Paper text:
These large modular proteins feature a N-terminal FERM (Band 4.1, Ezrin, Radixin, and Moesin) domain that is responsible for the localization of these enzymes to submembranous sites in the cell, a PDZ (PSD-95/Dlg/ZO-1) domain that allows specific binding to C-terminal recognition sequences in target proteins, and a C-terminal catalytic tyrosine phosphatase domain. The PDZ domain of PTPN3 (PTPN3-PDZ) has been identified as a target of the E6 PBM of HPV16 and 18. This PDZ-PBM interaction results in the ubiquitin-mediated proteasomal degradation of PTPN3.
The instability and tendency to oligomerize of PTPN3-PDZ made this construct unsuitable for crystallogenesis. To investigate the molecular determinants of the interaction of PTPN3 with the HPV16 E6 protein, we solved the crystal structure of the complex formed by PTPN3-PDZNext and HPV16E6 PBM by molecular replacement at 2.19 Å resolution. The PBM ligand binds in a hydrophobic cleft formed by the β2-strand, the α2-helix and the “GLGF” loop. HPV16E6 PBM binds to the PDZ domain as an anti-parallel extension of the β2-strand domain in a conventional mode. There is no electron density corresponding to the N-terminal extension of PTPN3-PDZNext in the crystal, which indicates a disordered region, in agreement with the NMR results that show an unfolded extension. A clear electron density map was seen for only the last seven C-terminal residues of HPV16E6 PBM (-TRRETQLCOOH) that are inserted into the binding groove. The hydroxyl group of threonine at position −2 forms a hydrogen bond with the Nε2 of the conserved histidine H572 from the α2-helix of PTPN3-PDZ. The side-chain carboxyl of E−3 forms a bifurcated H-bond with the hydroxyl of the conserved S538 (S545 for PTPN4) and N524 (N531 for PTPN4) amine group.
Residue numbers in the entry:
A (entry chain G): 1 to 7
B (entry chain A): 505 to 597
């Protein structure tokens, strides 16, 4: 669903 | 109330900065740091990045109308750039 992105 | 901080981060050996992003125009939420990875470049520079920081500018680019994936590509591109450095302007409560 809702986005969480590691960078 | 709130204030602006300019955080300069250079990436580590894996090309990572050490934070997590949520938000974007395609999500119905502002662009905010949802995690600081401890001891990472984001955590150790001075000033440093905090969880809950609202991203305002990325290398001077206004991002309030970009998608999550666009903001991610902008951050990844600062790596192989002029100074290898990522400049973030964030709003902090």
């Amino acid at each position: 669903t809702r986005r969480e992105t590691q960078l | 109330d709130s204030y602006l901080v300019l955080i300069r981060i250079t990436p580590d050996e894996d090309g990572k900065f050490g934070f997590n992003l949520k938000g974007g125009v395609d999500q119905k939420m502002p662009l905010v740091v949802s995690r600081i990875n401890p001891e990472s470049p984001a955590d150790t520079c001075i000033p440093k990045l905090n969880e809950g920081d609202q991203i305002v500018l990325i290398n001077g680019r206004d991002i309030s109308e970009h998608t999550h994936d666009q903001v991610v590509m902008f951050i990844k591109a600062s790596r192989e750039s002029h100074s290898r450095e990522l400049a973030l302007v964030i709003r902090r409560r």
